[PDB]
UniProtKB/Swiss-Prot annotation:
Forms a beta-barrel structure that accommodates hydrophobic ligands in its interior. The lineage of its organism: Eukaryota, Metazoa, Chordata, Craniata, Vertebrata. Keywords: Cytoplasm, Endoplasmic reticulum, Isopeptide bond, Nucleus, Retinol-binding, Transport, Ubl conjugation, Vitamin A. It comes from Homo sapiens (Human). Interacts with RXR and RARA. Interacts with importin alpha. This is Cellular retinoic acid-binding protein 2.
Length: 138
């Protein structure tokens, strides 16, 4: 039945550069990351509380597996290892809070939401700054 499961292709990406900036990515790389971000695809397999997610661009791909409620390890957007915990927020929104394994750094989090008109909305936060990316079904 229609849920988060499927194959998504980004259609819009607001605030990406500003986010990477908070994470101390230099300008040339930020510019390249913005370019790479327009080929963000996401594959989601969802069964109940349980999530498989492949995010990729042209040259890079990552997979996460999580169950809502259960702690799991992943990377932040700037690729630092962190412990992550996802909770539902309503029927079709989950929110994930992160804490770093080693080190100090910015407060990061992310959210995924299925909208009523069939878009997948992703937000990623670093302190005061919130990136938003919209996807549609491949």
């Amino acid at each position: 039945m229609p849920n988060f499961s499927g194959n998504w292709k980004i259609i819009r990406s607001e605030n990406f550069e500003e986010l990477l900036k908070v994470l101390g990515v230099n300008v040339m790389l930020r510019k390249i990351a913005v370019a790479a971000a327009s080929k963000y695809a996401v594959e989601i397999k969802q069964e109940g509380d349980t999530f498989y997610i492949k995010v990729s661009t042209t040259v890079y791909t990552t997979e996460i597996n999580f169950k809502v409620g259960e702690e799991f390890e992943e990377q932040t957007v700037d690729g630092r290892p962190c412990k992550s915990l996802v909770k539902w927020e309503s029927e079709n929104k989950m929110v994930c809070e992160q804490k770093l394994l080693k080190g100090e750094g910015p407060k990061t989090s992310w959210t995924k939401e299925l909208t009523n008109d069939g878009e997948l909305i992703l937000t990623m936060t670093a302190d005061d700054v919130v990136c938003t990316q919209v996807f549609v079904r491949e």
